[PDB]
Design brief:
This is part of a larger assembly, with two copies of chain A (51 residues), two copies of chain C (593 residues) and two copies of chain E.
Chain A (H helix, E strand, L loop, with lengths): L10 H40 L1
Chain C lengths: L1 E7 L2 E5 L8 E5 L4 E9 L2 E6 L11 E8 L1 E4 L7 E2 L8 H5 L20 E5 L7 E2 L6 E3 L8 E3 L7 E6 L3 E3 L6 E5 L2 E5 L3 E4 L21 H5 L8 E5 L6 H10 L6 E5 L4 H10 L18 E4 L7 H5 L1 H14 L5 E5 L1 H15 L12 H10 L4 E2 L7 E2 L2 E6 L9 H9 L8 H5 L20 H7 L3 H24 L7 H18 L13 H23 L4 H7 L1 H9 L9 H23 L1
Parallel strand pairs in C: 8-20, 18-24, 19-20, 19-21, 21-24
Antiparallel strand pairs in C: 1-2, 1-6, 2-5, 3-4, 3-6, 4-5, 7-17, 9-11, 9-14, 10-13, 11-12, 13-15, 15-16, 22-23
Helix pairs in contact in C: 8-9, 12-13, 12-14, 13-14, 14-17
Chain E lengths: L16 E2 L2 E5 L2 E4 L9 E6 L5 E10 L2 E6 L12 E8 L44 E2 L5 E2 L3 H4 L12 E3 L5 H11 L1 E2 L21 E3 L1 H12 L12 E2 L9 H14 L5 E2 L6 H15 L12 H9 L4 E2 L5 E2 L4 E3 L8 H9 L4 E2 L2 H6 L28 H25 L6 H16 L11 H12 L12 H7 L4
Parallel strand pairs in E: 10-17, 10-18, 12-13, 14-16
Antiparallel strand pairs in E: 1-7, 2-3, 3-6, 4-5, 4-7, 5-6, 8-15, 9-11
Helix pairs in contact in E: 6-7, 9-10, 9-11
The chains are: A mainly alpha (51), C alpha+beta (593), E alpha/beta (478).
Bound molecules: adenosine-5'-diphosphate.
Adenosine-5'-diphosphate binds next to helix 3 of chain D.
Main location (chains C, D): membrane
Keywords (chains C, D): ATP-binding, Hydrogen ion transport, Ion transport, Membrane, Nucleotide-binding, Translocase, Transport, Vacuole
Subunit structure (chains C, D): V-ATPase is a heteromultimeric enzyme composed of a peripheral catalytic V1 complex (components A to H) attached to an integral membrane V0 proton pore complex (components: a, c, c', c'', d, e, f and VOA1).
Chain lengths: 51, 51, 593, 593, 478, 229
Amino acid sequence: SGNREQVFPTRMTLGLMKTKLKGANQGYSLLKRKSEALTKRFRDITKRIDD
Amino acid sequence: AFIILDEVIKVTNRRVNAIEHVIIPRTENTIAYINSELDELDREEFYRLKK
Amino acid sequence: YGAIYSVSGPVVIAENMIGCAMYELVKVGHDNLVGEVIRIDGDKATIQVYEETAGLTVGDPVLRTGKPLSVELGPGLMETIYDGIQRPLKAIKEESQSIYIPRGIDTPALDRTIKWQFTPGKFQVGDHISGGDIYGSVFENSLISSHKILLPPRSRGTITWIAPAGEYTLDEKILEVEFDGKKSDFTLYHTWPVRVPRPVTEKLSADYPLLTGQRVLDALFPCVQGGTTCIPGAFGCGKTVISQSLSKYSNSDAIIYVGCGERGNEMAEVLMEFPELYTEMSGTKEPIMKRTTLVANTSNMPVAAREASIYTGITLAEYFRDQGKNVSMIADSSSRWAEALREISGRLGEMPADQGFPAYLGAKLASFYERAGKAVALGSPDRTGSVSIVAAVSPAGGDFSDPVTTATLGITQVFWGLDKKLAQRKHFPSINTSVSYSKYTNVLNKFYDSNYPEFPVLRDRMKEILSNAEELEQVVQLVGKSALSDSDKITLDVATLIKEDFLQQNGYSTYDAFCPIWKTFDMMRAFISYHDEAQKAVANGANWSKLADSTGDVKHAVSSSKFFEPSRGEKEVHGEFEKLLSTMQERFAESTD
Amino acid sequence: YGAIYSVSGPVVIAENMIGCAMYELVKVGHDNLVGEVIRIDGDKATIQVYEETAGLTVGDPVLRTGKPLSVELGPGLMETIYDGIQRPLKAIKEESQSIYIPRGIDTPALDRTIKWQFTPGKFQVGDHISGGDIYGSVFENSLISSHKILLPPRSRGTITWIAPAGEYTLDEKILEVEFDGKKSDFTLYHTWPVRVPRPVTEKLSADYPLLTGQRVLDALFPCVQGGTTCIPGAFGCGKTVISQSLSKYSNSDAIIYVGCGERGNEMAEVLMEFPELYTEMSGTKEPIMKRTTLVANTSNMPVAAREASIYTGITLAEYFRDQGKNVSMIADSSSRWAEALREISGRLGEMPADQGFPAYLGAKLASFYERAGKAVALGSPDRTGSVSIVAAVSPAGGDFSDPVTTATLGITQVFWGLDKKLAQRKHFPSINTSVSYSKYTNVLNKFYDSNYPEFPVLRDRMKEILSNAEELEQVVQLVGKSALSDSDKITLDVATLIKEDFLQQNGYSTYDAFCPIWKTFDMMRAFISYHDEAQKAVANGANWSKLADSTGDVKHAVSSSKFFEPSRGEKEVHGEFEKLLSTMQERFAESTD
Amino acid sequence: INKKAVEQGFNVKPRLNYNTVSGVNGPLVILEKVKFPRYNEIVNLTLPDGTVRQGQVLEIRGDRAIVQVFEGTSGIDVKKTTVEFTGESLRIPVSEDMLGRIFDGSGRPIDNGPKVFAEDYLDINGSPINPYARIYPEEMISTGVSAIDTMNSIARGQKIPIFSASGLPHNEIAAQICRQAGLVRPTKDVHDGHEENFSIVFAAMGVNLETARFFKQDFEENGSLERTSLFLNLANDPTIERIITPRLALTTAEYLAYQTERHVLTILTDMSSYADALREVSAAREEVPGRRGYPGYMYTDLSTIYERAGRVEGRNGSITQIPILTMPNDDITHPIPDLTGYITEGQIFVDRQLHNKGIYPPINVLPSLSRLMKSAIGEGMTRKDHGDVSNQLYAKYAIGKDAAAMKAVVGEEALSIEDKLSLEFLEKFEKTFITQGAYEDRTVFESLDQAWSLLRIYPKEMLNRISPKILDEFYDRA
Amino acid sequence: LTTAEYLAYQTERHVLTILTDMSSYADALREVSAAREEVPGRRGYPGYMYTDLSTIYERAGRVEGRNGSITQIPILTMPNDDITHPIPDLTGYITEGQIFVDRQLHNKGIYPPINVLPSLSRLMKSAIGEGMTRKDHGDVSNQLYAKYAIGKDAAAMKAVVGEEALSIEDKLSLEFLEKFEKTFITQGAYEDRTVFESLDQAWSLLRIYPKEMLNRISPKILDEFYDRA
Ligand SMILES: Nc1ncnc2c1ncn2[C@@H]1O[C@H](COP(=O)(O)OP(=O)(O)O)[C@@H](O)[C@H]1O
């Protein structure tokens, strides 16, 4: 069921992968908001280049 | 900025599609399936001892 | 009778205890603690005492009762507040003035002192009778005008003596029937093993909508009286509107609010609200408490009380179904009842099988929800009733993956799906239309085509435009709003109007506290016609912005359509809505030029 | 003798069993259900029952045969199908004349009324005879023309009388051996306890491949006559079809196909299919059922019998090893044997080890797998047999960490780990190249250098480019094909070519039902030569994006090279492959001008 | 001529009526002085009220019998309870007059009719079919469903389930298959279709009233209740009793098929509810749990339910079996779906994601599988191109899913030409091939024509799975 | 072990006592102590596994007044390849250090497939330095360990995040890890690399980095060995 990570299940691994999930989740949100900032600047650049 | 926005947008998309959605099943396995199963086995052994 | 032979925490092993069936409530100790026989071996039965066993002593008499856990059905049950095992939480506070519930208190579940007016039915002396036959009606209170009493479903025979009309207490031996020569007397009340459903003649197919009064619920995500329901019972989602609208506005002739192990202050809030909720129809001043009983449980009630809370609730609901009343439970936080089951299993040593929950959690939930359903009452006269279980689920950490919530989502047909985000934005009733599915939409066609023919396709159109706008918000996030086509902008504007003025219901103002089904249908027609006229006049005409600015008055009219007073009369409101639609059509015709 | 005392499923406790021995056959009930003693609590002897235990009562006599579970080796053992207790099934259906197996049916394992032609061996009257010596041969059938009858082990002495050439049933005395004053007389058949392996003179090293006719199994993860191979894999992943292809196409002079715990249909279709399928090892088209013994014990057949089935099958294979036949026992699921052990142990309520399995599971699996191995047969004339146990492991939930798989690993030199994800997309034989391994590549280099000298180099190249593909896909599924260099692109394209055209094998079409070793080696040369030429052309300057469409005919020729019919003959197919190689080289030289 | 008369059940057996109930716990009740207890015997508990619960001896020990009561042990007493040891294992009274009778969960008619005037008292969980006497089921049964016929073909005798999750239309799909099933090349034994139709043995177990009456209604709407013998065991019926309902339906199916020669379906809906009942009765006895709390004998028990299906050597009957079952979390690795996938002849997978898009049937053809397809397709039955068309469709659907994931990750532009081709193929697939009206019937030949017209999206070169002969003969317009 | 004790302590002989597949020993102990109805430990193994594995292990080491010594290298088939299995987890307690033979390195074809970071020798610190092997052994070992860990972390980041986010140190560490696993860990079955030429290879490997970046090396060892080439 779904894409496994083929990891060895133990409590240290659960904690490690929970922290890894938290890191990847905050990274997704952070890069998404960086992308919105850059695409805002990019749309400004596009309208100025059309002008 | 077009190249940078493409790279950042595809990184965020790759995160939300592959990375987070493979880390989540990894933890789902590690706790819900395996750790619960192992606790269940240990409780079976303890109940046999009690019997 | 039998004496205590062993005590270990709550379990108490009697002795010389021959004659106690399994699951038979036995009064334990000199204080008469109530415990149920959970396991019987030889002549000694492992009693599982409810209350704290801090005082039990070897040799303390345990006296049988010969009845499994039985609610005490009858008149006087309409208004009172009960704990898990039906101990009246008002009489306990009144006769034992202390704030606490004394150990082993045994106040009768129904008030014995009150004298009920009783008028006998068509069954004369000598008439053969059967289980469930209505042999008299009792004027309980002004909102339950005829609490039609009925013979217990497991009794039958020839009526030998019937009491004439008069005022009787619950111990007055109203009726005496004969079966096999063995006379048996019946009082105004009868008891029933809680864990077996009250039988019915035939369990029909529930196909009449449970008009909760909320616009989104009755319009998009309907529930059928007799059908089940699930609710996210997490804090702040807005469960209050659901519970109060079910108990205050819905067409249910009775309500059995049952709270399993809810936090003490939550039950305090509920027990302070319910006395001050009033019903505008069926008179003007009658509080809903005149027609609803509350099975309340703080989290420190005995674990068996919390585990039997929903069972006693459903048995009271089945009782009020057997009289022909479309009673509707509102089971608050069924997940706490699952917690009670988990504790009972673990303490009993029953092996956990899914995240700690017992093996029979799924079977118990399936059975308890199956005790729903519009049903033809037993015996004659043959009035039909219906029990609806609107059972909230509040998982341990909001995970919504533990087996209790999975089982409830699998079994409950409609899941109204409250949401926290929609509540923080103050968008009451905070229904998350994305996930709030409802599998009763199909069986309700037999009702819709009878008297609201266009309702199903209308809600399908409204839901599809709402989902299209939800999808297109992602496109608006990706690329600028201008990149959307005119039709897409129409969809977004109309769905914003929807979310702001059809789903979003004030609920506190007098105009939209109760949105009747006809007003909801007419608003649905108005909104969908607005989207359709905009869509057509743009697909064959001018740009969307020009029409929207040109027909902003029409949009304001359909938005203010929420304010039409339901008290103005169904005919007047329908005529007003027809006037609005006609003015709509002519205004779009004008602006089309 | 002793009577029943308890019947808890497939476990029966018998009292009065004072002389019983652990692991001693003990008939049960009035209809003589077969069973083995496994514990002794005094005089009470816990016994498994190898037949449906329903209907046993306390007091039913239990007899002590005084001999462990014996399998009747001898002629007439090869073409037929056996239940797990070594009872023929054709004879059962002809005896009961009912489509069910009767409980307690006592059918002699081998047909006692077939006159086997017998030709006496080199030993004469007076010649010292030792355990395992071949004293005659019987024309069992066309394919097994000389079923060398050999003296049972644990028996020796001097021949006093021998039977001349002729034809005998299995009961007719054949020779009489004198040891001390005792003159034991032997016949065609001799029983043997399955719990103990048949002795061998010495156990050599397995160094001749078990050409299994499957392209990936033959090329990348070979198995050796005498090697122990496991095929773990989720349900519907190809374990049974791989086992059947290995049974009906490999180079192995005999087959024991032990289906402990599979659906009856995958054992009825073996009987339906094998007779209409032919071989060529003997030098003539003869049905393959002439050589394969089916030890069938389906899932719903009595669970205790699964262990007896696996042991009977391995002992039959080991017997045919004692004759020099390169038999290859094929366990259909060792996991169901482990399930039988788990259910029996839990019924005894004792030693729950990892995941409920008994503690001794590792020891039993290790002993069972070690009963394999190419060994010099006992006695004289000298001959070298081989048993190569191929056993699907069928782990629960598809998890490689499932304890039966983990125990099976570490004792099996080969591990054809199947992957459910590949079997979903019908990518046969669904082997997972990433995690599969075969510790037998180091010992096969002698055979390769003797026959196909550059096979190991090609295998290493193929696995190298496949691993490069795996890491490249890991990169691409996160980055995309843009960042890839041109050599990375060609590695990815060639690896997709391999995974779709070489590793894949339809397993049922006439062209890839049996890919002989020479065709597999030829396609390794073809695919690796394609990769080398493409890599060289990219290095020499031509960009692969332009090259792809220009040489697309060559890539399609490589892809269609798997359609070269194996029956066309080595000369024809090798000529076609040399033609393909020459066309490849000339077209890749031309296209890079 | 009268060979049957040899039954002669006229001998009467007085049955002991024990009062010596010793101990009761869970669904177990323990006797103490039974004389020669039988292992799998049946007892009729007579509770003090008068209710007669039917028990089944489940373990014996000297003079003790661990009777496990089907309807629960609530109300069982020690003093007044009497137990009538019937003496013989649980046997359903069987006649071919069942066809048309809506039974209870435990063989009691609830159609307001009489008890079955039984031809014979067949024993439930009957002995396993001699695998030598089996005949490989290879007569294809045209279920009409396109997602099932051309890919994952069912063969008459296959044990093929219908995996699903609660809320999915597995009930609708099973009803369609049953109303729609027929052999691809019918034998035309009765040219008027009098005896060409499949009997049905529906075995609702642990299912709500709505679905049971839906199946009753849907059998009525198609003239099937003249041929169907329901065994509904609703949600409120006792939980242990859901163990014997499958063994009642399969026993009556064995009678109607092997002893009567009628090709008969068999539906065991909510087989996950049977799994739950098995787990509950196991944890009542504290048997060693399997993967996720289910008993260790889960595999063997589920097999005993399933393996009672398939054709037989000398008899024209055949028990096709379609056990509906719900993966609780749509998790195919759960011990309910996983084991029943190990036993049964491959499964039809009803996916939630496809249904959320709104298509019908939601059959996810990729993780489904059918093991009797390999024999029941080809030249003699269906058309010569069936096998390779199915394989190619599988491969291209999988590549389409891969391309959809790749589009979600790296955007659409980075997709190669064949990736966009495969995504177009997947869109047209899930929209016009998997999709099918709940009543629409597609014979496997026109399903294959749709499959070819949907594979013609690709050029002839990149259809590697298709054999070159079939590719030459069929890929063209004719 | 008792024959080894006789051989080493009572005959002053030098003995190296291999105990192959001690995971099977733990299995046998589990079988005995689960047929005894004992209270089971972490994974059904006997509770007393620690003591009846220490009694096996701790019969090693030199003794005062006797020239003998019992080295022992008990091979241990750790199951499912997780160190926290109670057999390897209860062996890591008793035995000072462990050589971790690692599967994914073997899949890449490296022999021996020894994974350094999980490998340890809790008394390696005293059999190194001056007067016994090369002077720089202790610091070179620490540096190789640290840069191998850095390289593996850089590889993990490169998988998760594109190569852009990797600093020059991370790219150098990836190159070092590749050359490490391919030329230093990799070793023929009969290679017999003496510790001095092993250290020379280690230095020729570490010289990838600038001298300012081998921070775990003491500056004296750096200035003395790094630039010799
Ligand atoms: N290499 C192959 N060749 C042909 N068919 C295959 C192959 N691998 C898998 N299959 C198909 O998949 C199914 C394999 O069943 P299998 O998984 O072996 O049963 P089990 O689940 O008992 O191992 C069969 O339907 C077969 O048609």
